[PDB]
Design a protein around this ligand. Structure first.
Ligand code: HEM
Ligand code: HEM
Ligand SMILES: Cc1cc(CCc2cc(CCN(C)C)cc(F)c2F)nc(N)n1
Ligand SMILES: Cc1cc(CCc2cc(CCN(C)C)cc(F)c2F)nc(N)n1
Ligand SMILES: C[C@H](O)[C@H](O)[C@H]1CNc2nc(N)[nH]c(=O)c2N1
Ligand SMILES: C[C@H](O)[C@H](O)[C@H]1CNc2nc(N)[nH]c(=O)c2N1
Ligand SMILES: [Zn+2]
Lengths: 411, 416
């Protein structure tokens, strides 16, 4: 059936037909909704050809050549390859199409208005961690672009038997280390304490500061991962200051400009690309709300509210909320003053609404996860708050995968 | 369905095990292939047949006798038999007072969208099932308001009018809440008062209400008894506790002339207990500050005063990346909380409410086997991620007794 979604502020009603094309499961049933569960829970030739066919069919449908000679010949070509090798290889055009569409279908991403403007770097000829490092450096340098950030993805060889996976062990290409202190607390980013310890265990000499860029830990063809230092001139960073509080710079805060997810899995036509780092540019709340103010992260709200001299004895003074806004003002101001691309959550959500209208027009829908699309601060003064959304799983897609250290047979 | 479901809190690492979802009875709207958790609402003549009513009543009676540790008892089987004979001969049945009280508390306890449920067992239940006229409804509602307000020391309460029979004799409160301000559409397109209430205000005016046409005009009650045409009543102003909104630091905030009423009282929902339908069941609690300060004032299609506050704050309103809206939103919520506490009118901030909700949820998982919760509604509309519910995985499912939405009565009423 056709499904209607309404915006309760503008009263715009959109009609969704795209969800009829999905066949992956969401985790909900008719009796339990799992829409706020973070992760609700190697292929044979037998499963692989229907997945390949489905993808080839939508690729040739997208280029207005469904049922053509090229389409029929590609299907037969892919059929032979799965027969004789138990897998197949994507053409370059298919790889680009598949990566852009995995972004387009990412229901949790508020940034998808940009989806067709993705730079795709084919790294499927890589064989070693040294080659991986070269490809990643080129990605970072291209995507950073001296502050004028550009979306990019680098795609390393697909999974074969599951014993020869390419993996970026880092969760993001650029991240700060976290140090569990003798006296029990944490120096740096507490989210990275375990990864930091693996790097130390693997030989990384930690500088033991608050903003130490972690090395890359790179695994090629299932071998033991290897450490590499990203050349510092490639790592663009922004000192955080505030347009009114001159004391803010004294907090010593900074952040990196490039957000680059390096631990997800990219699935296209049944093939699994277990190393596929991709990067865009920040929405300010990703830094200033979650990275700085989550209790299990940098957790600086107390320090800032102290310097603002707010009454912190009772929660109903909203001292946390006041400090939070100023921290996010500082972040946006700092990036903008350094001419590093950043979007505030008002502009981002506004763009997402326009993106939804576009997708409902041209595509018949847009899968969207309200729990993730709505920003972590000031939710209801953004237009996504009042937007009904339908969440459903289309492919190509990005998926989570287990951490490599929980799997890796060390050698 | 799997027998255990685990939810995790990603900030504290606490993992909870849900088995209560095995008792869920009605649909969520989701399927295996689509989630509808952000959809707001996923014939009146049609009432439950005898055959539909028997098992719903037995399910409720069993749950009631299990709750008082008398399951399988003589009284339990006799109650089952008495209900079964009532449905047989009259096509309906009547709840005992104990059952009605148990049912109302559990509809609250089961309300997945309610962050205030740590209080569910303290609900004061007023039995108004002997009411026959709109004048009597007005009497019951006034008594409810006065009891719940309690001079600012608010107490949660519900008043339950007679259940639906054939669907042509419904009791209804046409107001969506017992206390709301009027909204007036002007010829030039602007709105005075509360823009959410323009349509209901117009209904009242057509029914004979003479509107004073101000910014904070309490709407009259529009009350329907026994399926008759609804009738207008004015709540005595001394029963409507109001709070003038001022700010602890900004002396100019009082000059905005704002105020709000103290008692939030939903009156358009349907209470379903054991297959019986109570179409008029107004219930009241106390406010979370953000329900006034974020939504009632800063929603664009509401009072929309972020502009005027930002102007008096002399904020850079040119670019959104100044976060002038976020900054004004906080100050308004500071003023609302300060104004209620100063006048000693019960209110709860979103930090305290969400923290209490996490403790309630943990207790319910331990004592009851789960706690249905709707993340989209439980997370507050400002500062979501600095409250503990943001990081709490939740399972949503529908248990009975429950509060349900029902159609607006002006769309279905057959005018006499
Ligand atoms: C260009 C600017 C972009 C912005 C502002 C943006 C913004 C966001 C935000 C705020 C989230 C929420 C996730 C979180 O809070 O951790 C998200 C999720 C996501 N983004 Fe985007 N993004 C951008 C680009 C991209 C690109 C280039 C890709 C892939 C090619 C992508 C793929 C995803 C995926 C897969 C998720 C889901 C992550 C998950 O499920 O945990 N995004 N994005
Ligand atoms: C005692 C203090 C209470 C507080 C602080 C509270 C708070 C809230 C809040 C913030 C919501 C979401 C509100 C919205 O955005 O519209 C809500 C929803 C709800 N509450 Fe509570 N509530 C309280 C008492 C009660 C009582 C006494 C009942 C019934 C006996 C109740 C039943 C419900 C229901 C059914 C909903 C869902 C409403 C809907 O779907 O529109 N609440 N509550
Ligand atoms: C390409 C891309 C992805 C994402 C989403 C993932 C993502 C999320 C956060 C903050 C949220 N989380 C840590 C609490 C920081 C990041 F660096 C990051 F990659 N965002 C942006 N802008 N671009
Ligand atoms: C008994 C009760 C119910 C509710 C939820 C319903 C409810 C919601 C709002 C918010 C306004 N909405 C348009 C955004 C104001 C209310 F008075 C109100 F009853 N809340 C509180 N505290 N108590
Ligand atoms: C579209 C979405 O369902 C809608 O805006 C919801 C979102 N969450 C909400 N949460 C609460 N507490 N109250 C609401 O009215 C809403 N509205
Ligand atoms: C439990 C809940 O699903 C979890 O905390 C989610 C909520 N929404 C989110 N939304 C975004 N954008 N990013 C997140 O990490 C989360 N976390
Ligand atoms: Zn769902």
């Amino acid at each position: 059936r056709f499904l209607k979604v309404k915006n309760w502020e503008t009263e715009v009603v959109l009609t969704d037909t795209l969800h009829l094309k999905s066949t992956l499961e969401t985790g909900c049933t008719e009796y339990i909704c799992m829409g706020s569960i973070m992760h609700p829970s190697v292929a044979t030739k037998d499963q692989l050809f229907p997945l390949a066919k489905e993808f080839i069919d939508q690729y040739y449908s997208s280029i207005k050549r469904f049922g053509s000679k090229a389409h029929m010949e590609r299907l037969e070509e892919v059929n032979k390859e799965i027969d004789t090798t138990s897998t197949y290889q994507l053409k370059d055009t298919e790889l680009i199409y598949g990566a852009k569409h995995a972004w387009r279908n990412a229901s949790r991403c508020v940034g998808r208005i940009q989806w067709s403007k993705l730079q795709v770097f084919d790294a499927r000829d890589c064989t070693t961690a040294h080659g991986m490092f070269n490809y990643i450096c080129n990605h970072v340098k291209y995507a950073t672009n001296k502050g004028n950030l550009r979306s990019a993805i680098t795609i390393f060889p697909q999974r074969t038997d599951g014993k020869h996976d390419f993996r970026v062990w880092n969760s993001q290409l650029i991240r700060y280390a976290g140090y569990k202190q003798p006296d029990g607390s944490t120096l740096g980013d507490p989210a990275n304490v375990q990864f930091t310890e693996i790097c130390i265990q693997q030989g990384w000499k930690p500088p033991r500061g608050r903003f130490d860029v972690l090395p890359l830990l790179l695994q090629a063809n299932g071998n033991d991962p290897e450490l590499f230092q990203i050349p510092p001139e490639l790592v663009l960073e922004v000192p955080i200051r505030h347009p009114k509080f001159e004391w803010f710079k004294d907090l010593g805060l900074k952040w990196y400009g490039l957000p680059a997810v390096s631990n997800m899995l990219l699935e296209i036509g049944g093939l699994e690309f277990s190393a596929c780092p991709f990067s865009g540019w920040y929405m300010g709340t990703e830094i200033g709300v979650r990275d700085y103010c989550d209790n299990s992260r940098y957790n600086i709200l107390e320090e800032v509210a102290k310097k603002m001299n707010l009454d912190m004895r009772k929660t109903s003074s909203l001292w946390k909320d006041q400090a939070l806004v100023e921290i996010n003002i500082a972040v946006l101001y700092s990036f903008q003053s350094d001419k590093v691309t950043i979007v505030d959550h008002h502009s981002a959500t506004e763009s997402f609404i326009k993106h939804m209208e576009n997708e409902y027009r041209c595509r018949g829908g847009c899968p969207a996860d309200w729990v993730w699309i709505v920003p972590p601060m000031s939710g209801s003064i953004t237009p996504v708050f009042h937007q009904e959304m339908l969440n459903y799983r289309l492919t190509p897609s990005f998926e989570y995968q287990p951490d490599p250290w929980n799997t890796h047979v060390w050698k």
